[PDB]
Design a protein around this motif. Structure first.
Motif, PDB file in Angstrom:
ATOM      1  N   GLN A  81       0.815  -1.219   0.000  1.00 34.46           N
ATOM      2  CA  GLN A  81       0.000   0.000   0.000  1.00 34.46           C
ATOM      3  C   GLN A  81       0.852   1.273   0.000  1.00 34.46           C
ATOM      4  OE1 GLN A  81      -3.128  -1.376   2.666  1.00 34.46           O
ATOM      5  NE2 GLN A  81      -4.130   0.623   2.437  1.00 34.46           N
ATOM      6  N   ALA A  82       1.976   1.226   0.722  1.00 32.60           N
ATOM      7  CA  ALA A  82       2.867   2.373   0.887  1.00 32.60           C
ATOM      8  C   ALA A  82       3.644   2.732  -0.384  1.00 32.60           C
ATOM      9  CB  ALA A  82       3.809   2.134   2.048  1.00 32.60           C
ATOM     10  N   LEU A  83       3.837   1.733  -1.256  1.00 32.97           N
ATOM     11  CA  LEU A  83       4.519   1.912  -2.549  1.00 32.97           C
ATOM     12  C   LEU A  83       3.660   2.711  -3.515  1.00 32.97           C
ATOM     13  CD1 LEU A  83       5.724  -1.745  -2.647  1.00 32.97           C
ATOM     14  CD2 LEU A  83       7.371   0.111  -2.727  1.00 32.97           C
ATOM     15  N   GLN A  84       2.340   2.513  -3.412  1.00 28.20           N
ATOM     16  CA  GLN A  84       1.346   3.250  -4.192  1.00 28.20           C
ATOM     17  C   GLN A  84       1.272   4.730  -3.782  1.00 28.20           C
ATOM     18  OE1 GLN A  84       0.715   0.002  -6.406  1.00 28.20           O
ATOM     19  NE2 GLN A  84      -0.617   1.777  -6.801  1.00 28.20           N
ATOM     20  N   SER A  85       1.570   4.997  -2.498  1.00 27.95           N
ATOM     21  CA  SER A  85       1.473   6.329  -1.876  1.00 27.95           C
ATOM     22  C   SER A  85       2.455   7.369  -2.403  1.00 27.95           C
ATOM     23  CB  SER A  85       1.593   6.224  -0.350  1.00 27.95           C
ATOM     24  OG  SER A  85       0.319   6.343   0.272  1.00 27.95           O
ATOM     25  N   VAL A  86       3.670   6.926  -2.767  1.00 25.80           N
ATOM     26  CA  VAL A  86       4.716   7.802  -3.356  1.00 25.80           C
ATOM     27  C   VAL A  86       4.206   8.370  -4.706  1.00 25.80           C
ATOM     28  CG1 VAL A  86       7.091   7.779  -4.461  1.00 25.80           C
ATOM     29  CG2 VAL A  86       6.800   6.813  -2.137  1.00 25.80           C
ATOM     30  N   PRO A  87       4.212   9.718  -4.867  1.00 26.71           N
ATOM     31  CA  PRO A  87       3.643  10.379  -6.066  1.00 26.71           C
ATOM     32  C   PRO A  87       4.364  10.048  -7.368  1.00 26.71           C
ATOM     33  CG  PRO A  87       4.040  11.944  -4.301  1.00 26.71           C
ATOM     34  CD  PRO A  87       4.806  10.714  -3.950  1.00 26.71           C
ATOM     35  N   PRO A 101       0.594  15.836   4.723  1.00 26.61           N
ATOM     36  CA  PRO A 101       1.518  15.273   5.723  1.00 26.61           C
ATOM     37  C   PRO A 101       0.959  15.252   7.148  1.00 26.61           C
ATOM     38  CG  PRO A 101       2.260  17.470   5.078  1.00 26.61           C
ATOM     39  CD  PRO A 101       1.044  17.169   4.256  1.00 26.61           C
ATOM     40  N   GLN A 102       1.083  14.099   7.810  1.00 30.20           N
ATOM     41  CA  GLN A 102       0.664  13.932   9.206  1.00 30.20           C
ATOM     42  C   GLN A 102       1.635  14.667  10.147  1.00 30.20           C
ATOM     43  OE1 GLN A 102      -2.851  11.957   9.734  1.00 30.20           O
ATOM     44  NE2 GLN A 102      -1.521  10.516  10.864  1.00 30.20           N
ATOM     45  N   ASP A 103       1.162  14.962  11.362  1.00 31.54           N
ATOM     46  CA  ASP A 103       1.969  15.619  12.393  1.00 31.54           C
ATOM     47  C   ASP A 103       2.598  14.615  13.329  1.00 31.54           C
ATOM     48  OD1 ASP A 103       1.044  17.990  11.263  1.00 31.54           O
ATOM     49  OD2 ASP A 103      -0.376  18.455  12.780  1.00 31.54           O
ATOM     50  N   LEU A 104       3.723  15.011  13.930  1.00 30.15           N
ATOM     51  CA  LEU A 104       4.405  14.207  14.937  1.00 30.15           C
ATOM     52  C   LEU A 104       3.538  14.127  16.188  1.00 30.15           C
ATOM     53  CD1 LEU A 104       8.146  13.922  15.592  1.00 30.15           C
ATOM     54  CD2 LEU A 104       6.722  14.425  17.617  1.00 30.15           C
ATOM     55  N   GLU A 105       3.469  12.926  16.761  1.00 33.25           N
ATOM     56  CA  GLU A 105       2.732  12.657  17.992  1.00 33.25           C
ATOM     57  C   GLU A 105       3.736  12.477  19.125  1.00 33.25           C
ATOM     58  OE1 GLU A 105      -0.731  11.874  18.616  1.00 33.25           O
ATOM     59  OE2 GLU A 105      -1.584  11.494  16.615  1.00 33.25           O
ATOM     60  N   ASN A 160       4.543   8.769   8.281  1.00 38.71           N
ATOM     61  CA  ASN A 160       4.955   9.384   7.013  1.00 38.71           C
ATOM     62  C   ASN A 160       4.533   8.569   5.785  1.00 38.71           C
ATOM     63  OD1 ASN A 160       6.766   7.245   7.492  1.00 38.71           O
ATOM     64  ND2 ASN A 160       8.581   8.423   6.898  1.00 38.71           N
ATOM     65  N   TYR A 161       3.927   7.398   6.051  1.00 38.54           N
ATOM     66  CA  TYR A 161       3.423   6.458   5.032  1.00 38.54           C
ATOM     67  C   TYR A 161       4.502   5.846   4.117  1.00 38.54           C
ATOM     68  CZ  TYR A 161      -1.211   8.090   6.675  1.00 38.54           C
ATOM     69  OH  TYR A 161      -2.320   8.393   7.430  1.00 38.54           O
TER      70      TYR A 161
END
Lengths: 446, 52, 105, 425, 57
Positions: free
Chosen positions: A6-12, D7-11, D26-27
């Motif tokens: 899923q994370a590989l798809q996320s990179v633009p 972008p998500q924030d640091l927790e 950060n995905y």
């Protein structure tokens, strides 16, 4: 939860757009406050004849020392004052110039790159100053046993072809190269359909394409026609170069077979096997418990200070094998243990170890593409070598495909019963005779 | 004994099976040719020439 | 705990006495055959145990040579035969078996 | 459109026991987890020097939940890494793998840090690595200089040696490592930082496996600055030398002023093969020196002290001239010869430099961890840039003033025949 | 801005299971190889620079 697939798809997606003159403009937009912009030129030392072998390296030394629009100090001062970092490199196939800068400084960064690329003021006083600097660097490079052995490996493998030449050139060419020699190379090679303006960071693609028309337009009017320079293939020779030097503490050996080249789909499978063998170093914590058989035996029996596998890629060719540094008495065992590993993998590779090699590669690929400088480099290089940017999901798809059957078939195609190129430097009395190395390239049992 | 029983070893056997088969062929044809073993050699066309 | 489990223990004490390494001052673990797991366990012993082990082996080889045995009081008593190699040897085999389970997948 | 996800924030979470948890989703395809410990070289004492170096080398040894062999093989099976990065104050155990494999690497991470066994024979087998490890580091002339710099500067904790003293090689005991972990690897001295991990998971493992008490309290015995000079006759072609005085503790407003002064005088190069036109120290030396040389502003900040000054590489004969040109250049800033655009350039160099330093997950994670330990908080880049901006030109001059007039520390190696003592500067 | 790398100065050693041993943060040497005469210490019982975990596809 967010899975790895899923994370590989996320990179633009890398946005590729072509200018009217042939300049390819490509970007990977991210969230970062900074960026890396650069020009990647399809020019190296393979493009150079014997009489101008130091040229690309000489231009690289002059590229930041002053332009027609920015004389002397001017470029340095401008880049330095905005906090930016300016870098360049030249390999046998590619020359690159790139700026590490704030994203808001992208307009200036592109502008400055255009000046370096198009308007390099190759000042007569400077090219005379640069020749003493490059000569010193040659004396500097001699002391690096590693740099020497790989230069020797190219010299012997690519015997009497453009690829046998080093990026730096010989001493004769550095002291003889004229102002006209360098402008002639620059006019022939620094042409738009052989240049990629690559960028990575907090930038929109529309911003970048605007700037490329703003600063790179003016390489058309009329171009090419009279001199169309396409690379001829380079003959690989099974051969040996042995620079005996018993005054050096440790021996350096680089052994390689002919690899297929950038485009070939089975570079992925070769890299997996190269991961299985891997690399070692005396500072590694692992010791006897290391997965890799060569690494584990090398640590246990103190068989070297280091080894590393490689898959050096060129257009339609390359060098595939290993390099190691070891004691004078340990060269024979090291050759044996490595060669036996190539052969194990060629005939009897197993499912589990191949998954590990796949995993190391997935990790190597993702860990490498971390931040604007590695990604921008990957954009520029890939556009020159593949024509597109190969997305991470596709690399995974091509990695996932490689089972044990793939590894031993692909390894056999390149490794099994082939003539290696062998480069040796230092205390090399115990380095095997070529025939014996050649004999280790097949198994009588198989 | 029990240590050699696992997925890798089944793979390792499968990998060396065509090779170990072909060495059997080398051994057999080798033995047949060296003894002039008539029982097997009566079947092969050009080698057949030994008319009693 | 049991009358017949005291009998297995008395038959074991019988065998121990019949084996007769105690007559040469040896402990049971002194008498073990030296394989790879064993060699490593000896290697892994602390200084004091290794040094005692060396002396006990030394003493018994000396007695063996002169074809003598120790005075009865100096024989290693079954009750106090300290199995010093046990936890070391068990750990080496544990480690080997793991390596072997790993070499299987 | 080719746009990224927002972008998500640091927790960030301070546990009541003192332990810090920070995470950023950060995905990314890969994950990064660091346990940062207030266990650096400065917590060693004269009776146990080098214990934190052997410990640094010991991350792969048998633990209660995983054997030496298991840690190596299990991590490599998934293509993971386990690294331990010590500084003078911190020890950071960073683990790295693809996101599907976090759980395996976390377990390994927790075992290495919270349940090591330091087996007698395993520890004895590893001692020779201190010699190998040191030899490889010490082949940078800079390493021994910065080691000697700290030994000359402080009488105390930061004086400690980062690499194990030769006399202690083969001498650091399993018990010493057990004692080092028991009293430094505790909740109030620790921070767990995650990348490509969810906060509830990192908070879960911290509350389950990282609740450890019974160690030491504050940031150790307060590092006492002393000053002095260490000299190493070398025969090393070039002379490496570092001049330094006491500066500021990290986090303070004064610390930021020293960082701006560092960029005024000149840190690293910016252009590949460049004259370094904006480097104040470089230009000052080059005016008087024509041979190969290098000069840079040195800036080291710690929890309770700091060292600021400069570092020189020069030909043996040129040594005195390079150090004196460099020192006098600082002296002019102290006297008030510094323009507003001068500081602006340094400010942009420091701002952009910091931003570039946290671009990768390797650099981002190391920063959040160091922050968590030094400050007990996370400070966003926009506000760090705000603090950099807050530095007035007078504050930069005062930082120079403080250096010029403060008791000096010096370390030099090479042919020192023309290298000056502090006396003579 | 609290880090050894972000303040760029004091030394930072790095050991690992699979990757090469690293030494230190900032002080000059990169602008010392540009006035080129810096021969760089030999392989006298020594490891390898540049590390290895940056391999392309």
């Amino acid at each position: 939860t967010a899975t790895y697939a899923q994370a590989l798809q996320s990179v633009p997606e890398t946005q590729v757009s072509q200018l009217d003159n042939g300049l390819r403009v490509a970007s990977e937009q991210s969230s970062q406050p900074t960026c890396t912009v650069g020009v990647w030129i399809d020019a190296g030392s393979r493009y150079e004849s014997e009489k101008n072998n130091g040229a690309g390296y000489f231009v690289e030394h002059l590229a930041f020392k002053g332009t027609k629009n920015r004389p002397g100090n001017a470029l340095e001062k401008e880049v330095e004052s905005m906090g930016a970092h300016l870098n360049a490199y030249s390999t046998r196939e590619h020359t690159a110039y790139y700026i590490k800068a704030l994203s808001k400084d992208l307009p200036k960064a592109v502008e400055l790159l255009a000046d370096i690329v198009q308007n390099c003021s190759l000042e007569d006083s400077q090219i005379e100053k640069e020749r003493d600097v490059i000569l010193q660097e040659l004396q500097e490079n001699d002391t690096s046993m590693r740099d020497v052995v790989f230069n020797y490996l190219h010299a012997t493998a690519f015997q009497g072809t453009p690829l046998a030449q080093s990026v730096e050139g010989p001493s004769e060419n550095v002291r003889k190269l004229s102002r006209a020699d360098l402008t002639e190379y620059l006019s022939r090679h620094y042409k738009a359909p052989r240049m990629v303006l690559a960028a990575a960071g907090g930038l929109e693609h529309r911003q970048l394409l605007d700037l490329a028309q703003k600063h790179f337009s003016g390489l058309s009017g009329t171009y090419d026609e009279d001199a169309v320079p396409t690379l001829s293939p380079c003959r690989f020779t099974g051969s040996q170069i042995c620079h005996r030097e018993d005054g050096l503490p440790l021996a350096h050996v680089a052994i390689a077979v002919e690899g297929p080249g950038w485009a070939h789909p089975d570079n992925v499978a070769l890299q997996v096997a190269n991961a299985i063998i891997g690399h070692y170093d005396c500072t590694y914590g692992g010791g006897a418990h290391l997965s890799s058989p060569l690494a584990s035996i090398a640590a246990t029996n103190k068989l070297c200070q280091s080894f590393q596998t490689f898959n050096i890629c060129y257009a339609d060719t390359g060098l595939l094998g290993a390099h190691f540094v070891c004691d004078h008495m340990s060269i024979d065992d090291m050759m044996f243990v490595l060669q036996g590993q190539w052969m194990r993998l060629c005939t009897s590779a197993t499912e589990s170890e191949v998954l590990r090699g796949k995993n190391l590669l997935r990790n190597a690929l993702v860990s490498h593409l971390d931040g604007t400088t590695p990604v921008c480099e990957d954009i520029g290089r890939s556009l020159l070598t593949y024509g597109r940017r190969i997305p991470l999901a596709e690399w995974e798809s091509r990695i996932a495909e490689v089972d044990a059957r793939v590894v031993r078939e692909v390894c056999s195609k390149y490794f099994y019963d082939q003539c290696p190129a062998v480069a040796g430097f230092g205390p090399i009395e115990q380095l095997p005779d070529y025939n014996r190395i050649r004999s280790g390239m097949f198994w009588l049992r198989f | 004994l029990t240590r050699f029983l696992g997925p890798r070893y089944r793979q390792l056997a499968r990998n060396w099976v065509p090779t170990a088969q072909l060495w059997g062929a080398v051994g057999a044809v080798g033995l047949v040719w060296a003894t002039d073993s008539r029982l097997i050699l009566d079947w092969v066309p050009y080698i057949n020439g030994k008319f009693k | 705990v049991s009358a017949s489990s005291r009998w297995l223990e008395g038959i074991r004490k019988w065998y121990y006495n019949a084996a007769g390494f105690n007559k040469l001052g040896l402990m049971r673990d002194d008498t073990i055959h030296e394989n790879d797991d064993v060699k490593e366990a000896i290697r892994r012993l602390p200084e004091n145990l290794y040094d005692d082990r060396v002396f006990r082996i030394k003493r018994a080889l000396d007695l063996s040579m002169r074809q003598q045995i120790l005075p009865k009081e100096q024989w290693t008593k079954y009750e106090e035969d300290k199995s010093y190699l046990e936890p070391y040897l068990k750990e080496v085999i544990r480690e080997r078996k793991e390596r072997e389970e790993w070499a299987k997948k | 459109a080719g746009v990224p996800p927002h972008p998500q924030d640091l927790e960030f979470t301070r546990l009541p026991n003192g332990l810090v948890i920070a995470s950023l989703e950060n995905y990314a395809p890969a994950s990064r987890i660091g346990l940062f410990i207030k266990a650096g070289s400065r917590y060693e004492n004269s009776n146990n020097l080098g214990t934190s170096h052997l410990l640094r080398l010991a991350s792969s040894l048998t633990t209660k939940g995983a054997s030496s062999f298991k840690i190596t093989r299990g991590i490599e099976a998934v293509g993971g890494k386990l690294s331990v990065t010590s500084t003078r104050e911190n020890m950071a155990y960073t683990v790295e793998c693809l996101r599907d494999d976090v759980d395996i690497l976390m377990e390994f991470l927790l075992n290495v840090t919270t349940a090591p066994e330091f087996r007698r024979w395993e520890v004895a087998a590893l001692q020779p690595q201190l010699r190998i490890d040191k030899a490889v580091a010490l082949q940078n002339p800079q390493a021994h200089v910065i080691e000697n710099l700290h030994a000359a500067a402080y009488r105390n904790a930061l004086a400690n040696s980062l690499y194990c003293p030769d006399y202690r090689i083969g001498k650091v005991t399993p018990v010493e490592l057990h004692d080092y972990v028991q009293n430094h690897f505790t909740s109030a001295r620790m921070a767990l930082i995650g990348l490509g991990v969810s906060h509830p998971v990192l908070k879960q493992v911290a509350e389950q496996f990282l609740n450890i008490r019974g160690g030491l309290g504050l940031s150790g015995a307060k590092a006492k600055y002393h000053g002095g000079e260490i000299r190493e006759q070398n025969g090393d072609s070039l002379v490496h030398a570092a001049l330094v005085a006491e500066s500021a503790a990290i986090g303070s407003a004064e610390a930021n002023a020293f960082s701006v002064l560092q960029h005024v005088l000149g840190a690293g190069p910016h252009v590949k093969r460049g004259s370094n036109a904006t480097s104040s120290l470089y230009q000052a030396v080059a005016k008087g020196v024509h041979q190969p040389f290098d000069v840079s502003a040195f800036n080291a900040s710690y929890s309770d002290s700091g060292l600021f000054g400069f570092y020189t590489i020069s030909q043996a004969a040129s040594a005195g001239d390079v150090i004196k040109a460099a020192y006098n250049q600082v002296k002019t800033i102290a006297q008030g010869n510094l323009s507003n655009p001068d500081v602006q350039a340094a400010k942009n160099k420091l701002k952009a430099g910091y931003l570039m330093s946290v671009e990768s997950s390797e650099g981002f994670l190391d920063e959040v961890g160091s922050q968590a330990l030094a400050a007990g908080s996370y400070t966003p880049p926009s506000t760090v840039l705000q603090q950099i901006d807050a530095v007035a030109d007078a504050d930069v001059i005062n930082a120079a003033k403080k250096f010029v007039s403060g008791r000096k520390s010096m370390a030099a190696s090479g042919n020192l025949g023309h290298t000056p003592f502090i006396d003579e500067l | 801005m609290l880090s050894v790398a972000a303040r760029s100065g004091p030394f930072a050693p790095v050991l690992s299971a699979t990757s090469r041993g690293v030494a230190g943060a900032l002080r000059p040497l990169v602008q010392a190889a540009v006035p080129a005469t810096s021969e760089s210490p030999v392989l006298d019982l020594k490891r390898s620079v540049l590390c290895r975990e940056s391999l392309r596809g």
